[PDB]
């Protein structure tokens, strides 16, 4: 697959830096 902006980045960052806040939920 491809890298998708904030989608991939927010998840990636949260996984390493913490801050799941930016992931957005599968269901709020």
Task: Provide, rounded to whole angstroms, the least separation between the CB of residue 4 and other proteins.
Answer: 15
Residue 16 binds other proteins (CB under 8 A): yes
Chain centroid to CA 6: 7
Residue 22 binds other proteins (CB under 8 A): no
Structural tokens at position 28 = 């709020």
Phi-psi region of 18 (alpha: psi -120 to 50; beta: other; left: phi over 0): left
Binding other proteins (rule: CB under 8 A), the pick from 15, 19, 20, 22 is: 15
- Tell me which residues touch other proteins (CB under 8 A): 12, 15-16
């Amino acid at each position: 697959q491809n890298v998708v902006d904030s989608d991939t980045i927010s998840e990636t960052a949260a996984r390493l830096t913490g801050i799941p806040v930016k992931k957005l939920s599968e269901s709020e």
